């Protein structure tokens, strides 16, 4: 509809404010990977799990060095 | 004001003395000012002795504002290996013992034990900077009724000024490591007139930095810690209200915030200052990278004769590869430094009209700049 797209615009705003919070603490995530990590937390999953996983997968690409 | 003061004196300090004493043809302005004088005199008496307002003020300049300096240098000496590692593997039980050791070794031991107890360590969240050296603080904790003059916003100011006076108090000791390195290493190069060019050029680059970090550490003391101290000391020793003592303390700390480089407006100045601290910590590694190649050769050259009691020909060849690249690095480092500090000095003249400008007048009394500017 129109108000059914206004909610997703107001979610796009929250993704942008999270896009600023992600860069000022100097994380590695950018907008496209960040959308993945928020869609996972929509289902319900530990942040303490996902954080250790991305802390490993970023080191799992300099092990094909 | 009187009804407020006699209620503070009851509800917090719990110290008291029984029995205090058409218009009314001027009976207000006799009763009110008589009572005001009496209330304020006893209040100031007991606050400066039963909870020692003055002791806290004396230990907030010596320690937080670095008006001591034996205590601080012994602490920095013992806390160097703690600071060099990232603070995720640093915990508070390692801080408090090193603080204790410093206190016993340094001048602090002769002071009163209460204020030494009220000084204690803290940590910042996870590891500010990851270099390790930004992560530490000293906080003086207050738990008496005199918390009302050491208000919750002014502790933040104390920690800001301490933060700046921590970084600069490290960098000055890093440059005297540069000078200490010159004074020892150049006495081995009294037998090698090949490194003497680059070794000399380094000696001069060092002295150009040494002076400006000896003008900061004097301009902070005889204008920001000696006008400000006299101003506060007068505005306490005269004052006939606690409400005047508070509002003198607040602005004295605010003036230290403006004259030091801690405003949001002086961020442009602070950037230049961080970039000249950059060069100081850079110069250490660049300096040792010489001696870890140059000086190492000579001991091996002596051991070459020790075995005899073509290889060393390759080391003579290595001299002609080492020395020019060392000089060419030192040249661009020197010129980049002179340009960046000159760019600071021209900006320094206008952000404030007299105070910040004065450093630029103190620093050059040769007019090396304007013939380089």
């Amino acid at each position: 509809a129109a108000a059914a797209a206004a909610n997703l615009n107001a979610v796009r705003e929250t993704m942008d404010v999270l896009l600023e919070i992600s860069r000022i603490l100097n994380t590695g995530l950018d907008m496209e990977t960040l959308s993945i990590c928020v869609r996972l937390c929509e289902q319900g999953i530990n942040p303490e799990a996902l954080s250790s996983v991305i802390k490993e997968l970023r080191k799992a690409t300099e092990a094909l060095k | 004001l009187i009804g407020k003061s006699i209620n503070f004196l009851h509800q917090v300090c719990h110290d008291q003395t029984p029995t205090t004493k058409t218009d009314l043809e001027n009976a207000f302005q006799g009763k009110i000012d008589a009572a005001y004088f009496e209330t304020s005199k006893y209040l100031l008496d007991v606050l400066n002795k039963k909870y020692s307002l003055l002791d806290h003020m004396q230990a907030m300049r010596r320690y937080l504002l670095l008006g001591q300096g034996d205590f601080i240098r012994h602490l920095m000496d013992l806390l160097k290996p703690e600071l060099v590692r990232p603070a995720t593997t640093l915990y508070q039980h390692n801080l408090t013992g090193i603080l204790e050791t410093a206190v016993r070794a340094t001048n602090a031991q002769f002071d009163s034990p209460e204020i030494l107890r009220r000084l204690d360590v803290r940590l910042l969240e996870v590891s500010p900077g990851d270099t390790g050296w930004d992560v530490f603080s000293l906080d003086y904790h207050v738990d008496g009724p005199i918390a009302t003059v050491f208000t919750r916003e002014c502790m933040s100011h104390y920690l800001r000024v301490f933060n700046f006076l921590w970084r600069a108090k490290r960098m000055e000791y890093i440059l005297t490591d540069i000078r200490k390195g010159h004074m020892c290493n150049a006495k081995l190069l009294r037998n090698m007139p090949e490194f003497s060019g680059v070794l000399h050029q380094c000696h001069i680059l060092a002295s150009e930095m040494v002076h400006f970090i000896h003008q900061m550490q004097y301009y902070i003391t005889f204008e920001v810690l000696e006008c400000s101290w006299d101003e506060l000391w007068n505005k306490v020793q005269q004052a006939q209200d606690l409400d005047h003592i508070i509002a003198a303390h607040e602005v004295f700390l605010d003036t230290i915030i403006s004259r030091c480089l801690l405003d949001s407006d002086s961020r442009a100045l602070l950037n230049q200052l961080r970039a000249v601290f950059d060069q100081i910590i850079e110069l250490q590694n660049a300096q040792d990278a010489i001696y870890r190649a140059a000086l190492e050769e000579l001991q091996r050259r002596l051991q070459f004769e020790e075995k005899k009691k073509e290889e060393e020909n390759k080391r003579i060849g290595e001299f002609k590869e080492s020395i020019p690249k060392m000089c060419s690095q030192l040249r661009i480092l020197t010129h980049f430094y002179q340009g960046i500090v000159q760019q600071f000095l021209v900006l320094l003249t206008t952000s404030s009209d007299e105070s910040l400008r004065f450093l630029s007048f103190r620093l050059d009394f040769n007019e090396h700049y304007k013939a380089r500017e």
């Binding site: 603490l25 990977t33 303490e48 954080s51 | -």
Partner: protein, 106 residues
């Protein structure tokens, strides 16, 4: 369903493995899912996350970074108005928290 595609895209993005027919892709994926299913953490404490946010603000004001302090407060106060909040915050916090002397560009 979308969760599985997300975990695939997370492997592709973070680990830099854009070919699902690489065995290293399937190994990293099996690792990611086995990590997710090994329940070993307490659930997120919103109060501890709030205390950590305010201490970050305190660290910004202690270092006279006023624009970063004001932006930190404004962004976190805005975001915390319409559980998963404190999740994403703790996530990013553990993840790097490599905010140095600068790291700002706000």
């Amino acid at each position: 369903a979308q969760q599985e595609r997300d975990v695939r895209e997370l492997v592709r993005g973070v680990a830099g493995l854009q070919d699902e027919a690489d065995p290293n892709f399937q190994l990293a994926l099996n690792f990611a899912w086995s990590n997710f299913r090994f329940h070993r953490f307490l659930d997120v404490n919103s109060h501890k996350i709030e205390k950590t946010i305010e201490g970050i603000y305190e660290k910004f004001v202690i270092h006279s970074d006023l624009s970063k302090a004001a932006s930190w407060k404004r962004l976190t106060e805005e975001f915390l108005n319409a559980d998963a909040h404190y999740s994403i915050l703790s996530l990013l916090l553990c993840l790097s928290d490599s905010p140095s002397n600068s790291s700002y560009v706000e």
